Amino acid sequence: ACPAPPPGQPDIRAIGYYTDKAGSVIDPALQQQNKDATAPLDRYAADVARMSDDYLRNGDPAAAQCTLSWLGAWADDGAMLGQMIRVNNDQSFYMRQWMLDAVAMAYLKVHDQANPQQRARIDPWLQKLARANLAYWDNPKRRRNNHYYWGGLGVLATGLATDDDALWQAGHAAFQKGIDDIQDDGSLPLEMARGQRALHYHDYALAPLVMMAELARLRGQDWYASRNHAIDRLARRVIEGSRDPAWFNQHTGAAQLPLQASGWVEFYRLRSPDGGVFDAAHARGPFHSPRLGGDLTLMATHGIVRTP
Ligand SMILES: O=C(O)[C@H]1O[C@@H](O[C@H]2[C@H](O)[C@H](O)[C@H](O[C@H]3[C@H](O)[C@H](O)[C@H](O)O[C@@H]3C(=O)O)O[C@@H]2C(=O)O)[C@@H](O)[C@@H](O)[C@@H]1O
């Protein structure tokens, strides 16, 4: 009753799809190539997201055992521990970050049903993907925009699930840089340079900062307070933007593409409702995002974990 996982490929070969300097103008052809080259990775991500969602939703341990079996299978296969093949950019590396986020979060959701044999296979594999993602960012030439925040989520989840203190601190460092980047107007200077997609990249930067704050909460820490509730500016800026892009239209001189806020709202409204400004976005739910851990509605309402 646990279906067969797809084989785990050690190598990734994703493809960058932006043509302009502002990373805002898509080549439909290049977008399709990336979509097709990453479909297997995205299927696995959605699947372990979904089965771990199933486990949170009814507590059936079969769904948790099937999640753990899939994670174990890709760990034994050494999935994603091979070559990040550069094609026109660092997209293969970005996928290893995004995939660690999905698998680490899935693991964490079903971690209370893992047996010693399962921890021993999965933990080393998460730790290895975590330390590889981290070493990319030791190079000061690498621009620490939203990619560093998405990297941080997976490293933070791995540190929590595998009880590795170094990864926990290193994940905290990726969260802290994102918060430190929030200006008084709630903008992120590197995301302000994405022209047409500036509002999208503000929302996109925020989602993993929220989820990292939520992982801290599991451990009994409150990171939401950092730098006098700086996150609230980015949150209000983003939710303002989804309603009316005018501020973004002026500040970038580009007409923002259409945007609805992503599933961070599910968590954020509970921690800082700000007189209901995030309720309209909530009403559009439920939100499914495998790279943020899957059903953000379910996890916001009922917890990322069923037991501490
Ligand atoms: O078509 C979709 O909307 C597609 O979104 C996918 O996630 C995107 C993500 O929203 C974001 O735009 C990200 O941006 C990267 C980009 O790929 C490239 O590396 C750029 O130069 O850096 C960007 C950055 O983060 O700043 O790209 C994600 C991606 O997967 O390519 C998925 O959620 C997908 O499932 C969905 O259909």
The amino acid occupying position 297 is: T
SS3 13: coil
Q: Resolution reached, in Å?
A: 2.3
Which residues partner with 26 through β-bridges? Answer: 18
Helical segments of the chain, H only: 28-58, 61-76, 91-110, 116-136, 146-161, 165-180, 198-218, 226-243, 246-252, 264-271, 279-283, 296-302
Distance 197 CA to ligand 1 centre (A): 11
CA 198 to each of CA 170, 179, 245: distance values in angstroms, whole numbers, following the listed order: 27, 17, 10
Backbone angles phi, psi at 181, to 5 degrees: -75, -20
Task: Please return the burial class of 205, using the count of CB atoms within 10 Å of its CB with bins 0-12, 13-18 and 19+.
Answer: buried
Task: Please return the burial class of 155, using the count of CB atoms within 10 Å of its CB with bins 0-12, 13-18 and 19+.
Answer: buried
103: Cα within 13 Å, side-chain hemisphere: 31
Distance 13 CA to ligand 1 centre (A): 15
Distance 61 CA to ligand 1 centre (A): 33
Which residues partner with 84 through β-bridges? Answer: 12
Integer Cα distance of 88 and 85 in angstroms: 10
Q: The tokens of 24 are what?
A: 């805002």
**262 in contact with ligand 1, CB cutoff 6 A:** no
Q: What domains sit in the chain, N to C, each tagged with a CATH number?
A: 28-302 (1.50.10.100)
Length of the chain: 308
Answer for the pair 307, 111: CB distance below 8 angstroms, yes or no. no
274 membership: H or E segment, kind and range: none
Integer Cα distance of 190 and 192 in angstroms: 5
Q: Ligand 1 pocket check: which of 44, 204, 259 to mutate, most ligand atoms within 8 Å of Cβ?
A: 204
Q: Return the closest-CA partner of residue 50 out of 6, 109, 1.
A: 109
Q: Ligand 1 pocket check: which of 43, 94, 97, 259 to mutate, most ligand atoms within 8 Å of Cβ?
A: 94
Answer for the pair 215, 160: CB distance below 8 angstroms, yes or no. yes
The amino acid occupying position 47 is: D
